[PDB]
Each structure stands twice: as C-alpha cells, then as structure tokens.
Design an enzyme around this catalytic site. Sequence first.
Site, mmCIF file in Angstrom:
data_model
loop_
_atom_site.group_PDB
_atom_site.id
_atom_site.type_symbol
_atom_site.label_atom_id
_atom_site.label_comp_id
_atom_site.label_asym_id
_atom_site.label_seq_id
_atom_site.Cartn_x
_atom_site.Cartn_y
_atom_site.Cartn_z
ATOM 1 N N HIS A 198 -0.067 -0.500 -2.718
ATOM 2 C CA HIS A 198 1.382 -0.532 -2.841
ATOM 3 C C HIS A 198 1.985 0.423 -1.822
ATOM 4 O O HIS A 198 1.303 1.297 -1.280
ATOM 5 C CB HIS A 198 1.837 -0.164 -4.259
ATOM 6 C CG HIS A 198 1.597 1.269 -4.616
ATOM 7 N ND1 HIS A 198 2.613 2.198 -4.684
ATOM 8 C CD2 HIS A 198 0.459 1.935 -4.921
ATOM 9 C CE1 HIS A 198 2.112 3.373 -5.019
ATOM 10 N NE2 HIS A 198 0.806 3.241 -5.167
ATOM 11 N N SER A 234 -3.409 3.006 -5.141
ATOM 12 C CA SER A 234 -2.540 3.937 -4.416
ATOM 13 C C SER A 234 -3.394 4.671 -3.388
ATOM 14 O O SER A 234 -3.997 4.006 -2.529
ATOM 15 C CB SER A 234 -1.817 4.819 -5.435
ATOM 16 O OG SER A 234 -0.924 5.715 -4.796
ATOM 17 N N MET A 235 -3.480 6.003 -3.422
ATOM 18 C CA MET A 235 -4.288 6.715 -2.438
ATOM 19 C C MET A 235 -5.759 6.340 -2.542
ATOM 20 O O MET A 235 -6.482 6.386 -1.541
ATOM 21 C CB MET A 235 -4.111 8.224 -2.612
ATOM 22 C CG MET A 235 -4.962 9.066 -1.672
ATOM 23 S SD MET A 235 -4.768 8.614 0.064
ATOM 24 C CE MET A 235 -3.018 8.909 0.304
ATOM 25 N N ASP A 251 3.151 -4.100 -5.701
ATOM 26 C CA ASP A 251 1.782 -3.900 -6.154
ATOM 27 C C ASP A 251 1.002 -5.205 -6.069
ATOM 28 O O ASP A 251 1.492 -6.264 -6.473
ATOM 29 C CB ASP A 251 1.774 -3.370 -7.588
ATOM 30 C CG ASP A 251 2.474 -2.031 -7.720
ATOM 31 O OD1 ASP A 251 2.956 -1.506 -6.695
ATOM 32 O OD2 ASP A 251 2.543 -1.504 -8.850
ATOM 33 N N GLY A 301 -2.470 9.548 -6.377
ATOM 34 C CA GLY A 301 -1.775 10.809 -6.543
ATOM 35 C C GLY A 301 -0.851 11.137 -5.389
ATOM 36 O O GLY A 301 -0.202 10.248 -4.830
#
Lengths: 192, 338, 333, 123
Positions: free
Chosen positions: A121, A96-97, A170, A67
């Site tokens: 990423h 991600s996070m 990614d 997010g």
Amino acid sequence: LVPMVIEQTSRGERSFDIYSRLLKERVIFLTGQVEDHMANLIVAQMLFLEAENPEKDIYLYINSPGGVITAGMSIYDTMQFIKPDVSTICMGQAASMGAFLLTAGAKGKRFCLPNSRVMIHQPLGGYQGQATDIEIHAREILKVKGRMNELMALHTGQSLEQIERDTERDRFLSAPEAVEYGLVDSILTHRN
Amino acid sequence: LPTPHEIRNHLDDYVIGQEQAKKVLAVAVYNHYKRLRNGDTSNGVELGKSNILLIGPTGSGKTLLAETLARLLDVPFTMADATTLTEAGYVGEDVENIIQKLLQKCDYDVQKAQRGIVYIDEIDKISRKSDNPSITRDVSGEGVQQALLKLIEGTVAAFLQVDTSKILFICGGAFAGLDKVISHRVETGSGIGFGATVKAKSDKASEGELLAQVEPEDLIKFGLIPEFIGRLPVVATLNELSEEALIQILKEPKNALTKQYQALFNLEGVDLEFRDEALDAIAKKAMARKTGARGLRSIVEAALLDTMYDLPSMEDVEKVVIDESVIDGQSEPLLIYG
Amino acid sequence: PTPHEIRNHLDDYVIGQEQAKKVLAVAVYNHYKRLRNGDTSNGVELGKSNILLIGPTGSGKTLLAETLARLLDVPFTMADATTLTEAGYVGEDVENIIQKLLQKCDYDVQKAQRGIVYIDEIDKISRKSGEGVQQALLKLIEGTVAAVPPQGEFLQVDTSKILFICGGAFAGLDKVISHRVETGSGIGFGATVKAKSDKASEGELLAQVEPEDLIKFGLIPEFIGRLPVVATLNELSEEALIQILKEPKNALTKQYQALFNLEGVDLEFRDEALDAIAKKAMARKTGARGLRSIVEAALLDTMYDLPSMEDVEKVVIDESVIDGQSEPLLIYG
Amino acid sequence: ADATTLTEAGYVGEDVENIIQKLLQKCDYDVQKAQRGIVYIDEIDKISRKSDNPSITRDVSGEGVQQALLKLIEGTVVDTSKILFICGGAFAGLDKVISHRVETGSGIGFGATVKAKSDKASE
Ligand SMILES: Nc1ncnc2c1ncn2[C@@H]1O[C@H](COP(=O)(O)OP(=O)(O)OP(O)(O)=S)[C@@H](O)[C@H]1O
Ligand SMILES: Nc1ncnc2c1ncn2[C@@H]1O[C@H](COP(=O)(O)OP(=O)(O)OP(O)(O)=S)[C@@H](O)[C@H]1O
Ligand SMILES: [Mg+2]
C-alpha cells in the site's frame, strides 16, 4: 519466557537462548511493528554477521504488519550495503514495510511460505498545523511515495506506472501470486 | 671465490621460482667466504657468523638448494637428518658423528676440512616437546638441540681436534605449524561498523607472505631453544612455487616428470606428447593440493593411470596425445594407430 | 674491577639506561666480590643478592645481562618462563640449562658457581598454572642442593652461589604504579589521559616501584622477597634509537661499513638517513631488534650488486633511498 | 595370558610378542608343536579404548595394545597363522550401550517411553 538451548562443542558446553542460537548461524528475526528501537537492533545484527564472515549469506525472516517508514529504510540500506547477500523469507505475513523488505533481498534468493501473504500500500502519514507547514509535509510524503515505488519496480521488475496504480490501495497477494508479481522468486513448501 | 651473481646464475639452472631465496643465500654465503679469505678481521667490529636458515613449505625444494650449492662449491658438504640425531650414550645415532662425516668426505684432510660446510635437514623434527607421555628417557628432543648449539657457537672437540668456529653451518627443515603462530601475532582484529575494514576468509594473505615476516619469539614458541635462534642471524625464507613456476619446473628441468613418462613408454615402442594447454592445467591442480612439486607427479600419474593400464595390452599403437580435456577427465586420451 | 670500571666498559656496548647501569653494576660487583672471598675468614656468611629487571619489551633488558656477562670470563645462560619451566608435567625444568652453564666452563662445577643464569619473561607467570611455577621457583632462586644429577658418577651442586637475575616486560605495571602515587582519574573530563604517541613518561613512573606494586600484579610475596635488588629501564625514544646506530661500538652502521671496507668500498650514513630509519622502526614496534632487519634490507639490493660492479670507490646512502624513491648514489672512481 | 599386563610395543612391560613366548615355554620350545597349539586371553575388556575421551595421547595400555594384537591374532611374523585364539573378559558397562540401542525410548512428554526398573530389561 525464552527457552535456553545448549550447543555441544569441543571447548565445552555453552549457554544460549533460542534466538541467540539461530543468530550464530547467520539468522535474523523481524517480528513486531517496525520502529526505531527494533529496527536499530536488526541493523546491529547484520553488521556483526558481516564482520564474522563477509561472504556467507545472512538470512532474515520477515513477519510483521509494518511500522514506521523511516525506521524501515535504515534496514534496507544496510542490506544493500553489506557485501553478504541478504536472503529474505516471508513467514505468516508481510505488509507495509514488511512487503518492501521482502522484495529488497538479493535477486534469486527471495522465498516465501506456501501460506504466506504479502500486502502493499502507499505511504501513510498526516500533519496538523499552519497552512505553510501542511504544504511542506505534504510534499515530503509525496516524495517518499515516489522513491518507494521506484525501488519496488527495481526488484520486482515491473514498470513504474504499474507499481503506482497497484499501490493506490491495499492489495493482497497470496504466495503463488507473489512469484509472478516479482516480490519473491520461489516458494518453500517442503524440504528436499 | 664466486661472486653473488655467479652463484645465482648457476643455482637457477636447477631451482626455479625462488629468485628471492637464492639472492639472500648468495649474499650470506658470499660474505662468509670473504671472512675466510682474510681472517685477520682488522676491523674492530666483529661481524657475526653468517648462518643461513632454510625454512619454507613442504615440496618447495629446500633440500634441492643444498645439493645444488654443493656442486658449485669444492669444499666438503655433508647432509645429516636431525631425525636420526640423538643424545650420546644411546643406541641412537650420536650427534658428535656429524663433524666426523665432514672429515671422511675430505679424504681425512683435516687441514683442508676446517673450511668445510655442513647442512642439517628437518631441524623442526627435534623441537623440544613435553616428556610427559614420552618414554622413560626422552633421548630425542631438547637434548639434540642443546648438543648442536655447542658446535654452532664454536668449540674444539674430536683423531685430530677440529675447530668449528670457522666452519660454515647451514640449517634446514620445513617448520610445519609455524605459520599458525606467525599469523596469530601479525593478524589484527576487524571492525564491525560501516567504516570498518572487513577482510574475507578466502582473501587471506598467502603462506608465502606470512613466512616473509618472522620474529625470534615465533621460533622459541615452536620449540627451538632461544640460544639456537640467535646463532642464526641469516634466515633465508622460501615461498611456495607459483603456477608459472610449476610449468617451468615441469618442462625445463632435464629430469622433468613429463619426459620421465615419455621415456617409460618408449620401452614398448610408444611415445606421447603433452599439449601446451594441458601443462598449465596440471600446474593449477598441483597448487590446489598444496604438496609443492611432489603434487605434479601424482596428478600426471592419475591422468595416465588408464593409459598405462590398457596401452600395453592393445596392439598397433603409434602415438598418444593428451590435452587439457583428457587430464580434466572430460574425455579419454587420444591415440592414433599405426 | 671496581663498580666505576664496570660502568665505563658497559656503557660502550650499550647506550642509555643510566639508572639501570648504576644499580646493575653495583649488584654484580657485590655478588662477585663475595664469591672471590671463598675463605670467608669472618664467621658471617655471605648471602646472594638476586637482581630484578623491569622494563618495556625491546628496552634491552636481555642485552644488559649478556653484555655485562661478556665483560667477565664467567659463563652466562638464558631461560624462558613462558614454557612453565619445572621438573614435571608443568614444563621443562631450567635445571638442564644450569648444566649447560656448567658445560661452558669446561664442565667444572667449581667455576659453575659463578653463573649468571637469567630468566626472561618472568612477568608471564603472574598469578591470575601460573602460581605453581612461582612456588616451585622459590627454592631454586635460593640455595638448594637438589638438581638434575650430572653425568660427569652423579653429583648434586647447590644453586646458592650462582647469581640469579629475573627480568620480564611487565604489562600494565605502569597503571598500578600511577594509581598508587600519582593522582587523577583515568576516565572523565578532568582525567589525565596519556597520549599513546607522545608523553612517554612510563620509564620515569617505573622508577617509583615498590614491592607492594608487584604484590598486586600477581607475584606472590615469597617470590618478591627472593629478589631484593630492583632495577628499572626506561623506554627508548625516537632519538634514542638514532644514537644506538652510531654511538655503540658494535653498532649496525659500523658493522656494515666495515664489511664493505674489505673490498675497498666505504659507505657513509648521513644524519638524515639515520633518523629516517628510526622513525619507521618505532611504528613497526620492533624496537632495536628490528633495526638490523630494516637497515640490512635497505642496503641489500646494492650490497648484492656491489661485488659485481667495477670501478667503485665509495658508495653513499641518502634519505630518499630509505623511502625507496631512489637508490644509493655511487661515486665512480 | 593377562591382557592388563600387556602393553604397546616400544614401551616397558610385556608386549604382544611375549604372548607367544609364554606358549613356547608350554611347548618345550618346539616350532612344530607350537603351530598346532591354542592360546587364551583373560581380561580382554580391560584394554578397551576410552571412547568417552577423544584419543589425544598414545594409549600404550589401551588402543595400542589392540592395534598390536591385530597382526598376531590373525597371523603374522615365528608364525601365528595356524593357532586358535580365544579372548575372554567380564565386560563392565557393555549392558548400558546395548540398552541405549534396543530400547531407543526416553523422554518427558506423553509420547515418551517410561518404565519402572522392574519392567526394564535385566543385564
Ligand atoms: N624449486 C624447485 N625447482 C625444481 N624442482 C624442484 C623444486 N622444488 C622441488 N623440486 C623437485 O621436487 C623434488 C623433491 O622435492 P624436495 O626438495 O625433496 O622438497 P623438500 O622441501 O625437500 O621436502 P621436505 O624435505 O620433506 S619439507 C626434487 O628432487 C625436485 O625434482
Ligand atoms: N640499549 C640497547 N643498545 C643496543 N641494542 C639494544 C638495546 N636495547 C635493545 N637492543 C637490541 O634489541 C634487541 C632486542 O632487545 P632485548 O630487550 O634484548 O630483547 P628481549 O629482552 O629478548 O625481549 P623479550 O623480553 O624476550 S619479549 C637486542 O638483542 C639488541 O640487539
Ligand atoms: Mg629478552
């Protein structure tokens, strides 16, 4: 609907929900896209657990595609500030996070499920406006990218250059590969 | 007659690790003797009766303090346990016999017995308790406390009438559970935000500090009648023996358990010595048991349990050496044949 | 003694509480003057006038009843309501304490009728069991022959001639009183927020207390009716504690100084030192109760070494001594 | 003898020692003939401890009675180490505990074990 469980104690029957019952045992859940509202809720839970007992470990299950980067940074600071060691366990996926928080746990206490997947990423952003404004935003996102790479190398133990190259695009790593990379320590397959 | 320094010097010869306890007791007892020497009390203000209260953790040595001070003083000193004390008119030991015990010890010298001192042990055992499941008549309980208050305040009762107004009274007994109420009142809440003071459960104030700060409301809640607390303005609070104090009490005392076992083995012609590195290890283990000095005897008994089980059976034994590893269970005690 | 004489003697032992001394002195004089008239020539019966004491904890409510009782030769006993005193599973009936008062008077029921039995922490049994204690205490407060049979043959004395004084440190009573007579909100920009460390107006507000306020606090109407006389005590300010150190006849400073005078060494406390002890005492919240403990500890170090030290004429304690910076100065001689 | 009338030692009422006293009345107070006698107890289940409520107060009429019986039942000290003892009582509710163990089957889902009262084991 949230099932309501009952805990038997000397005082008497107590009413609690599924999430509240686990929270009493120093357990936190991180589900859904990271945002300001959900991130703030997690931070509050960590502070409450620390006050109750500043020594018992605080678990945190990470299961989300990611997010807002700014919202995630608040959770990372709280984990590194509270004296209790935060144990992070990846369930389902952590991208991600989510991946960053997975490796932010206390050294020697990071775990992941056998079928869990972690993706890393580079930061994603974007701004529109005048040329001068675009330049300021471009520099801001670049600085955030460098800081995130340094933190990742601190936990996983890899070199800064290696993290930058792997974050250009990614990268999907299975649970066995996560241990070697340094994101996690071991894999919890069966209870022993 | 003895200055506070004299009583402290002679008192430490037996008790160790309680310098603060002997200081407060020495000052209060010394002040009472001054009033007895000159009872005219020309000063308008009437100083309150100096009654010292011995409260502390089990095994600290409260009873030891009472016996040690008795030797220094020449006035009669009798010890009575509140457990046997009961209400009058029952098979239980009457409380009015305590004063009589002080007269017999003085050879019926009533004139010289008015300046005696009496000590009571296990006061917390007579704390008032609800008489709901109790027997038909609660012979033991608040009744004993009220009867004692009659003599503490100062009354003439019987023989030859003896005035208890000038008779020094010292209380004792280890209040078990009083640390819960004291800690509840002093303890405060802890914040939850970042700028909040969070204290770990392990890093909690030791029982020694909690007892150092007490209030009358705590004693009343424990069971003691409110009037009894007021009669004891002096409250000598003791502290649990520290690790450094345990080792000293383990060797310096003449009747130290270490030498007790050494003499025990001398019956069969064998002797043993405790290494310095082992004395401190035994002291720390005793502190964990939280049993005071009594824990030292149990620890050494278990460590030497195997030694006494096979030593007499074996032959050609000369000496036994015990170190930190032996007591810790890592290895068996060393023995040299001769 | 007339009420004026009672006021003159009591103010010497206790300072402050001028309003409480006027109402308390008149209440005791009216009750005792009635008992002395045992003949009761007039056909009109004399009823007891129970007293009620309200004030902050540590204000000296208990010291007012005990000190006033000492002025007379009548016995005085105390009880605590925190234990739910009652003749049953609720707790321990105070009837036993009544017998204690009888014992003080050479176990004479005739003299026991002049008892000043006082019940403390009465506010702790406020209705929210709590109400059960009040109900069972209604009859005891008034005349009732029923009581624990004494063992000196079994008698049954009445609790009508024995004065009853109930007093407790009511918590939050000042809030209900303010919401009744005083105006203004407690929350908001226009609200009149009372400073915790300043503007100690709780004592003045308590004076404007009516039976209606006690009804909302939790006390049942029957209990309030039993106590017609009502008194209030104001909180002791930082300066008030300073006066308690010297003005009272049996003050802490006078007691310790007299003790040292026995050995020929006189100690003097300067005004600077007295205020230093009072300021720290207020922070501890112990009130006048903790004044004796803090003062004794400060001079405990030198008191122990005073008898052993030789060539001593008179000692003195400075303000810095209280803070621990230095030790009491000694004048050799 | 009656177990209900019995009570823990140190309290009013017939104690465990009274059981032997009654036996003496039946043996014309003869120690030799008492050692060879037999005793019977009825309503033994009435002195059972209330396991539902944790023991917080001395159960003079319950747990206390059984504790005292532990000595004289097997022999203690008059010596009762050579007299047979028979205990009997109409245990009420014991069938519920037994069923909760042997049956060990309940629930709501399909895998649960549900049976009609007719098929349920009788007392
Ligand atoms: N401070 C001490 N110095 C030396 N020996 C001590 C000390 N305290 C206890 N002891 C030893 O411990 C033995 C028994 O301890 P006690 O004085 O009986 O403890 P206690 O406080 O009386 O226990 P209670 O009465 O059950 S709370 C004494 O005979 C001493 O040998
Ligand atoms: N006006 C006063 N003058 C002198 N000493 C006072 C005064 N008020 C209080 N004290 C002292 O402070 C002590 C405690 O005050 P009290 O109000 O008598 O305590 P208390 O009433 O027992 O408190 P509670 O109601 O039980 S919590 C007294 O015993 C006195 O020594
Ligand atoms: Mg009081």
